[PDB]
């Protein structure tokens, strides 16, 4: 309606700020190499075909 600018940037910048905040909180709090390749991780054996 004859407006001077109406874009999603208002929400995208908020999302970027929230992502930076989440990155700050996540690198330190409780994530410790989740057991995705556990059970002798050294035994990947060409990408853990399991």
């Amino acid at each position: 309606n004859y407006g001077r600018g109406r874009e999603l940037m208002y929400q995208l910048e908020k999302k970027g700020k929230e992502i930076k905040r989440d990155l700050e909180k996540i690198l330190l709090s409780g994530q410790a190499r989740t057991d995705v390749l556990a059970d002798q991780y050294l035994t990947n054996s060409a990408a853990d075909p399991a």
Partner: protein, 49 residues
């Protein structure tokens, strides 16, 4: 079967179309061809009387 050099009933003829297309959809729009528009910003507008 054919023995008189007939060319009208041969197999493998072309089509020979008109090369153009017709359309009669009227788009006169008298009520729109008259006084134009006024751009807005929002979906709802209002006026006083």
């Amino acid at each position: 079967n054919p023995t008189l050099f007939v060319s009208y009933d041969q197999n493998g003829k072309k089509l020979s179309f008109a090369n153009w297309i017709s359309v009669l959809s009227p788009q006169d729009t008298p009520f729109v061809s008259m006084t134009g528009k006024e751009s807005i910003n929002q979906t709802i507008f209002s006026w006083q009387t």
